[PDB]
Amino acid sequence: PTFTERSQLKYARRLVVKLGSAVITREDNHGLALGRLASIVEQVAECHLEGREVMMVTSGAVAFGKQKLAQELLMSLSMRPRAAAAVGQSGLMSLYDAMFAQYGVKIAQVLVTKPDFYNEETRNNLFCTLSELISLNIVPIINTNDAVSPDNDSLSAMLAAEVQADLLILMSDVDGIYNKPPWEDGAKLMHTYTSKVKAATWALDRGVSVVICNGMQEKAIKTIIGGRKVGTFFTE
Amino acid sequence: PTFTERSQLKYARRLVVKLGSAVITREDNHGLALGRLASIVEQVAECHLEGREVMMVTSGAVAFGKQKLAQELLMSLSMRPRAAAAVGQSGLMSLYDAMFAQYGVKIAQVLVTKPDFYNEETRNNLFCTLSELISLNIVPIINTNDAVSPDNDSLSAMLAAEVQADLLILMSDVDGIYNKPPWEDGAKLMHTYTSKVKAATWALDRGVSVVICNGMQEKAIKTIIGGRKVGTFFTE
Amino acid sequence: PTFTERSQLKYARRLVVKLGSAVITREDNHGLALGRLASIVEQVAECHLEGREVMMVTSGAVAFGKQKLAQELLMSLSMRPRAAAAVGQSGLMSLYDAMFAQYGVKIAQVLVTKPDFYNEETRNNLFCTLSELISLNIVPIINTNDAVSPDNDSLSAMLAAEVQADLLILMSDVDGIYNKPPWEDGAKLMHTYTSKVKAATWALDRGVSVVICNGMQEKAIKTIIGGRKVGTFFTE
Amino acid sequence: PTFTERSQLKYARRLVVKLGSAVITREDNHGLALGRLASIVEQVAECHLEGREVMMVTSGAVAFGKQKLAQELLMSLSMRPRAAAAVGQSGLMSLYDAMFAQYGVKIAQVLVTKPDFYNEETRNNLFCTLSELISLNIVPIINTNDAVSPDNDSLSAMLAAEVQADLLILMSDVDGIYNKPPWEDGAKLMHTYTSKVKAATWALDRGVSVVICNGMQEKAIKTIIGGRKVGTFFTE
Ligand SMILES: N[C@@H](CCC(=O)O)C(=O)O
Ligand SMILES: N[C@@H](CCC(=O)O)C(=O)O
Ligand SMILES: N[C@@H](CCC(=O)O)C(=O)O
Ligand SMILES: N[C@@H](CCC(=O)O)C(=O)O
């Protein structure tokens, strides 16, 4: 890429957020934590009204479907996942629509899957779709196709690579990257950097400066864009 | 198949409706005709509460997106389709959710495309999804993937074939199938039968008794299921 | 008023529709008939896009709440209306919002009750609200306050009187007004005119030309505005 | 009442929250802050799933309408509040419905105004409505009638009085009640206690133990119910 130090990260013109499946779902995998989700939608809409062109990759659509049913799964578990995923995708897109249009923005559910990034025709089609959507002041929300799926991070890295984004914020649960497992002497967190780690290395080789923050920390995106020593930063 | 005469069509246990792109969109391709759409949703929900297991194939999602934007396309046509398709898919699934839950039913947007019916892994996945959704008392709504698309009828025929449905109602604009173009002497409509025609022949060879009704006719599905001489009927 | 013959009714600049409680609720009082409701919303939105300034008075909000619960009333009828009315008002306003914004219009739920038309302060406030809403290209939907209520037709007449509307369409179930009960010789329907009848006489004395159509008849509003001999017409 | 010390507040069986007009609207009066609103909805739904019977009094409905229009007010401010209030009430009830049903709860918009608490017939009707709604496992949301209105706190006090609630949480912006204006020596915050102050004294005389917390403090309700020295507590 071109970015080297965290001080430069105020000049990134195309973010790609990626809400991890452990940030937005409450501590059961049986709900949808509204606190962190509303905070992250607030930060993303505010950052998009600032002039950048964000593009979320929302994970965790099975949880909304599980909680929306909560009855037909119960009455069937005594007489007897993808169905929950489908129903949840629909309902979650509705809820995102509400909580985003509460800031003036519009959204547009784009559904892809990892095989769609391998053939050239589908890659061309998807890039054309995303560019026509970005040029219209819309925030695409790129979920994974649930009905053709056997933690959507490699997908986010590859998507940032194709669209060639400046940043790639990768929210998660762990505070960052340590030097050794936490149950050890010398758990020195490595802010800079000489699964998530592999995808970050990939996106680094493809011209993308990955950053791995902590989801539960208040005002995460607005902080990491500014330059505070938060999260993790991958660059030679 | 097994069905021969229209009198037998009261014993079909798995319908596959298919709302044509000229039935639900008002006469501009710039809106969404609520009259026919509400009538067809009413008939389908009533038929599903009767014991059958319907599965719509709703076309015309670009119209809802076009009308929902109506401003950002305007202001851009002076300074300068898939984007409209995406936004419309989201909004239309929301509207279907409302107008179906007004009858007690639940729906679940399933998004496929014609290449998903060629590989074996995706076909297995999709069939498992649809069976897990049918066994849960849900009405799947199978739109075509807009973001990986370069009048969704061949798709409906192939989908009915894979799930192996008894009937396949194929709503449209024309009253049926004539003997010659209308501007000719002897336009004898052929109810029985010794694009739509080709797909119907295909689905006939694959064990599906296709039927082509007229959309604007009031109470179409409830009539054709009963046995009245409406629409068209394909069987040797 | 000023209108005398049905030919003049093309120059009315302020309609007040009133959907009767027997037109939109399906034939159980336990649902919400989507066919007639969608047709009437289509006609009203089309008439409003024509330059007039309509203002619906939607009845039947208890039905939507009854059907939306359908479970918590059931499980309680073995261990043991206004609650259904409240929940239904909310859900029905949401559904109207969807099916109206599908034509570009916006709506704004205004909740009044008959005692609000007797004191002068509340009458002034309500008139100011309605005029500020009409001058903004919005279609107010004037339901009756359910939580302060012990077939909302007198309300519609009085509302048309205060706002001083040219027309007052009063949709209902009966085709019109007969000369005698139907089980009699000589059931001559009286189109012109030298409960509903009393409210119509009132609104006639207050400068409003009431018209009573049949709800189930297709394209009712567009017909009666044109001048066809449909419904009933009250004028000396 | 019966409660004296904050240690006893774990045994209150009927809360009445009241979200102040400065907690949920972002710092413009031109939006709807999703962070605090989602946090408060999360806390209230969690407290209601605990066995209590909460009943919100959501303020700030004009902000949602202002932001939802944002265009028709703009284009009219060059050619030229209650309208915004009406549109906002509708949209905000929809958003609350979504963010509450994401926890399993159902809600039911109840619209009252201060004159509805003075006549006996309307008071009886409203109490019957609220009791029939509480006995159904529903969370009523008691906004003030905007179309018959010339910071809804006296309303909340009187409502808690009529329903005779154990607690009355009154969220706001100020951390509590000080001994003197902040620009003075000796700004000793008074947790216990020997506008908001007047309403609290009233509700104390009517058998209600008022509590005034700080909205922006994370996990406010769950804390104050527990017994931590937060907010303010009114009791002799
Ligand atoms: N269902 C997908 C995730 C879809 C989503 O992004 O919500 C999975 O389990 O991998
Ligand atoms: N956009 C697709 C149709 C999608 C739909 O079914 O709505 C097409 O034009 O073929
Ligand atoms: N609940 C009211 C009618 C309210 C409405 O207009 O829906 C009644 O029964 O009179
Ligand atoms: N519009 C009312 C408040 C209504 C509400 O609770 O949102 C007022 O300004 O007093």
Side-chain angles (χ1 to χ4, degrees):
Chain A
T2 45
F3 291 78
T4 37
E5 303 284 353
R6 197 139 23 201
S7 74
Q8 274 60 25
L9 279 194
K10 327 153 179 303
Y11 315 133
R13 208 49 71 178
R14 172 184 275 110
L15 302 193
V16 173
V17 201
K18 185 257 175 171
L19 279 72
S21 155
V23 157
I24 75 177
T25 88
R26 74 161 53 99
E27 301 69 20
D28 308 308
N29 197 34
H30 194 268
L32 197 297
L34 282 204
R36 284 114 66 182
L37 192 89
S39 153
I40 291 164
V41 149
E42 165 183 74
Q43 293 164 35
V44 152
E46 173 254 48
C47 154
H48 162 274
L49 294 184
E50 198 219 335
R52 303 174 202 283
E53 303 297 18
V54 291
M55 163 203 330
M56 303 179 50
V57 188
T58 279
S59 61
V62 290
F64 190 95
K66 194 175 314 303
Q67 170 51 58
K68 180 184 163 191
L69 296 168
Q71 213 68 274
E72 322 196 90
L73 261 173
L74 207 60
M75 280 157 88
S76 89
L77 254 284
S78 45
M79 300 326 169
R80 280 292 188 180
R82 314 201 227 178
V87 190
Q89 174 59 32
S90 153
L92 178 93
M93 269 308 302
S94 155
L95 181 58
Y96 270 139
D97 230 323
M99 268 194 316
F100 255 115
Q102 212 33 75
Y103 279 90
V105 200
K106 298 188 182 306
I107 72 190
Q109 163 201 260
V110 173
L111 261 178
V112 313
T113 177
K114 183 59 132 48
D116 312 331
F117 289 87
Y118 281 159
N119 197 343
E120 292 316 282
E121 280 143 19
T122 166
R123 167 129 69 164
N124 181 0
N125 294 137
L126 171 59
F127 173 78
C128 171
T129 290
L130 270 186
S131 276
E132 261 176 12
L133 261 166
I134 277 196
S135 45
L136 257 156
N137 183 349
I138 305 201
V139 174
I141 294 170
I142 313 189
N143 258 115
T144 299
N145 205 324
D146 305 69
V148 182
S149 46
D151 184 25
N152 67 21
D153 42 18
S154 43
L155 162 90
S156 183
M158 177 160 212
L159 152 76
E162 172 207 338
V163 199
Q164 192 63 20
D166 327 314
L167 252 205
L168 163 58
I169 300 171
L170 208 171
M171 313 258 251
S172 301
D173 36 42
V174 53
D175 318 308
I177 287 302
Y178 296 118
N179 192 20
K180 270 172 179 182
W183 26 262
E184 213 156 10
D185 273 308
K188 298 189 180 310
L189 180 76
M190 47 185 85
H191 293 283
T192 186
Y193 203 83
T194 173
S195 40
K196 315 224 163 204
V197 183
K198 280 77 193 170
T201 50
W202 177 329
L204 161 69
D205 308 295
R206 270 63 159 198
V208 154
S209 59
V210 198
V211 151
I212 299 177
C213 304
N214 180 326
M216 300 64 169
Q217 173 169 348
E218 269 269 282
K219 254 54 187 178
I221 310 280
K222 208 187 318 186
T223 283
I224 178 57
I225 292 288
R228 279 190 35 82
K229 283 192 165 189
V230 78
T232 318
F233 186 92
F234 290 62
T235 290
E236 154 62 40
Chain B
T2 45
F3 291 78
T4 37
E5 303 284 353
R6 197 139 23 201
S7 74
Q8 274 60 25
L9 279 194
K10 327 153 179 303
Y11 315 133
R13 208 49 71 178
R14 172 184 275 110
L15 302 193
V16 173
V17 201
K18 185 257 175 171
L19 279 72
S21 155
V23 157
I24 75 177
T25 88
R26 74 161 53 99
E27 301 69 20
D28 308 308
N29 197 34
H30 194 268
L32 197 297
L34 282 204
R36 284 114 66 182
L37 192 89
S39 153
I40 291 164
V41 149
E42 165 183 74
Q43 293 164 35
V44 152
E46 173 254 48
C47 154
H48 162 274
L49 294 184
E50 198 219 335
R52 303 174 202 283
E53 303 297 18
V54 291
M55 163 203 330
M56 303 179 50
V57 188
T58 279
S59 61
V62 290
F64 190 95
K66 194 175 314 303
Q67 170 51 58
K68 180 184 163 191
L69 296 168
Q71 213 68 274
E72 322 196 90
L73 261 173
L74 207 60
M75 280 157 88
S76 89
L77 254 284
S78 45
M79 300 326 169
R80 280 292 188 180
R82 314 201 227 178
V87 190
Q89 174 59 32
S90 153
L92 178 93
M93 269 308 302
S94 155
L95 181 58
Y96 270 139
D97 230 323
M99 268 194 316
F100 255 115
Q102 212 33 75
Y103 279 90
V105 200
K106 298 188 182 306
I107 72 190
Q109 163 201 260
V110 173
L111 261 178
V112 313
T113 177
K114 183 59 132 48
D116 312 331
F117 289 87
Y118 281 159
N119 197 343
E120 292 316 282
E121 280 143 19
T122 166
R123 167 129 69 164
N124 181 0
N125 294 137
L126 171 59
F127 173 78
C128 171
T129 290
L130 270 186
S131 276
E132 261 176 12
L133 261 166
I134 277 196
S135 45
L136 257 156
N137 183 349
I138 305 201
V139 174
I141 294 170
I142 313 189
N143 258 115
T144 299
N145 205 324
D146 305 69
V148 182
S149 46
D151 184 25
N152 67 21
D153 42 18
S154 43
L155 162 90
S156 183
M158 177 160 212
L159 152 76
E162 172 207 338
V163 199
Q164 192 63 20
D166 327 314
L167 252 205
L168 163 58
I169 300 171
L170 208 171
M171 313 258 251
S172 301
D173 36 42
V174 53
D175 318 308
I177 287 302
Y178 296 118
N179 192 20
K180 270 172 179 182
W183 26 262
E184 213 156 10
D185 273 308
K188 298 189 180 310
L189 180 76
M190 47 185 85
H191 293 283
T192 186
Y193 203 83
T194 173
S195 40
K196 315 224 163 204
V197 183
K198 280 77 193 170
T201 50
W202 177 329
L204 161 69
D205 308 295
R206 270 63 159 198
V208 154
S209 59
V210 198
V211 151
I212 299 177
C213 304
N214 180 326
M216 300 64 169
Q217 173 169 348
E218 269 269 282
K219 254 54 187 178
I221 310 280
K222 208 187 318 186
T223 283
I224 178 57
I225 292 288
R228 279 190 35 82
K229 283 192 165 189
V230 78
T232 318
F233 186 92
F234 290 62
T235 290
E236 154 62 40
Chain C
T2 45
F3 291 78
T4 37
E5 303 284 353
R6 197 139 23 201
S7 74
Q8 274 60 25
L9 279 194
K10 327 153 179 303
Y11 315 133
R13 208 49 71 178
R14 172 184 275 110
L15 302 193
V16 173
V17 201
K18 185 257 175 171
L19 279 72
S21 155
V23 157
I24 75 177
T25 88
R26 74 161 53 99
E27 301 69 20
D28 308 308
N29 197 34
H30 194 268
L32 197 297
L34 282 204
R36 284 114 66 182
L37 192 89
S39 153
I40 291 164
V41 149
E42 165 183 74
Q43 293 164 35
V44 152
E46 173 254 48
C47 154
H48 162 274
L49 294 184
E50 198 219 335
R52 303 174 202 283
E53 303 297 18
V54 291
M55 163 203 330
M56 303 179 50
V57 188
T58 279
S59 61
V62 290
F64 190 95
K66 194 175 314 303
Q67 170 51 58
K68 180 184 163 191
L69 296 168
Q71 213 68 274
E72 322 196 90
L73 261 173
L74 207 60
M75 280 157 88
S76 89
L77 254 284
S78 45
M79 300 326 169
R80 280 292 188 180
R82 314 201 227 178
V87 190
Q89 174 59 32
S90 153
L92 178 93
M93 269 308 302
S94 155
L95 181 58
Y96 270 139
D97 230 323
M99 268 194 316
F100 255 115
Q102 212 33 75
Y103 279 90
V105 200
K106 298 188 182 306
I107 72 190
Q109 163 201 260
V110 173
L111 261 178
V112 313
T113 177
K114 183 59 132 48
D116 312 331
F117 289 87
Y118 281 159
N119 197 343
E120 292 316 282
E121 280 143 19
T122 166
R123 167 129 69 164
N124 181 0
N125 294 137
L126 171 59
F127 173 78
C128 171
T129 290
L130 270 186
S131 276
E132 261 176 12
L133 261 166
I134 277 196
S135 45
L136 257 156
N137 183 349
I138 305 201
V139 174
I141 294 170
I142 313 189
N143 258 115
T144 299
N145 205 324
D146 305 69
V148 182
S149 46
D151 184 25
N152 67 21
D153 42 18
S154 43
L155 162 90
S156 183
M158 177 160 212
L159 152 76
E162 172 207 338
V163 199
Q164 192 63 20
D166 327 314
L167 252 205
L168 163 58
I169 300 171
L170 208 171
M171 313 258 251
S172 301
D173 36 42
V174 53
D175 318 308
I177 287 302
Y178 296 118
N179 192 20
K180 270 172 179 182
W183 26 262
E184 213 156 10
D185 273 308
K188 298 189 180 310
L189 180 76
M190 47 185 85
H191 293 283
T192 186
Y193 203 83
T194 173
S195 40
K196 315 224 163 204
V197 183
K198 280 77 193 170
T201 50
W202 177 329
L204 161 69
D205 308 295
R206 270 63 159 198
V208 154
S209 59
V210 198
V211 151
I212 299 177
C213 304
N214 180 326
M216 300 64 169
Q217 173 169 348
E218 269 269 282
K219 254 54 187 178
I221 310 280
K222 208 187 318 186
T223 283
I224 178 57
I225 292 288
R228 279 190 35 82
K229 283 192 165 189
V230 78
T232 318
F233 186 92
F234 290 62
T235 290
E236 154 62 40
Chain D
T2 45
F3 291 78
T4 37
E5 303 284 353
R6 197 139 23 201
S7 74
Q8 274 60 25
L9 279 194
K10 327 153 179 303
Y11 315 133
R13 208 49 71 178
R14 172 184 275 110
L15 302 193
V16 173
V17 201
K18 185 257 175 171
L19 279 72
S21 155
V23 157
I24 75 177
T25 88
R26 74 161 53 99
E27 301 69 20
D28 308 308
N29 197 34
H30 194 268
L32 197 297
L34 282 204
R36 284 114 66 182
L37 192 89
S39 153
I40 291 164
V41 149
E42 165 183 74
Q43 293 164 35
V44 152
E46 173 254 48
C47 154
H48 162 274
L49 294 184
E50 198 219 335
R52 303 174 202 283
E53 303 297 18
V54 291
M55 163 203 330
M56 303 179 50
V57 188
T58 279
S59 61
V62 290
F64 190 95
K66 194 175 314 303
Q67 170 51 58
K68 180 184 163 191
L69 296 168
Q71 213 68 274
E72 322 196 90
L73 261 173
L74 207 60
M75 280 157 88
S76 89
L77 254 284
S78 45
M79 300 326 169
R80 280 292 188 180
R82 314 201 227 178
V87 190
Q89 174 59 32
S90 153
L92 178 93
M93 269 308 302
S94 155
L95 181 58
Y96 270 139
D97 230 323
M99 268 194 316
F100 255 115
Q102 212 33 75
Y103 279 90
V105 200
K106 298 188 182 306
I107 72 190
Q109 163 201 260
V110 173
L111 261 178
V112 313
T113 177
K114 183 59 132 48
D116 312 331
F117 289 87
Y118 281 159
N119 197 343
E120 292 316 282
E121 280 143 19
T122 166
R123 167 129 69 164
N124 181 0
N125 294 137
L126 171 59
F127 173 78
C128 171
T129 290
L130 270 186
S131 276
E132 261 176 12
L133 261 166
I134 277 196
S135 45
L136 257 156
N137 183 349
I138 305 201
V139 174
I141 294 170
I142 313 189
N143 258 115
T144 299
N145 205 324
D146 305 69
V148 182
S149 46
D151 184 25
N152 67 21
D153 42 18
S154 43
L155 162 90
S156 183
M158 177 160 212
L159 152 76
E162 172 207 338
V163 199
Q164 192 63 20
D166 327 314
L167 252 205
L168 163 58
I169 300 171
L170 208 171
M171 313 258 251
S172 301
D173 36 42
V174 53
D175 318 308
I177 287 302
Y178 296 118
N179 192 20
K180 270 172 179 182
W183 26 262
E184 213 156 10
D185 273 308
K188 298 189 180 310
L189 180 76
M190 47 185 85
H191 293 283
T192 186
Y193 203 83
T194 173
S195 40
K196 315 224 163 204
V197 183
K198 280 77 193 170
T201 50
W202 177 329
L204 161 69
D205 308 295
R206 270 63 159 198
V208 154
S209 59
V210 198
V211 151
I212 299 177
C213 304
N214 180 326
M216 300 64 169
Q217 173 169 348
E218 269 269 282
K219 254 54 187 178
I221 310 280
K222 208 187 318 186
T223 283
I224 178 57
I225 292 288
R228 279 190 35 82
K229 283 192 165 189
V230 78
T232 318
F233 186 92
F234 290 62
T235 290
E236 154 62 40

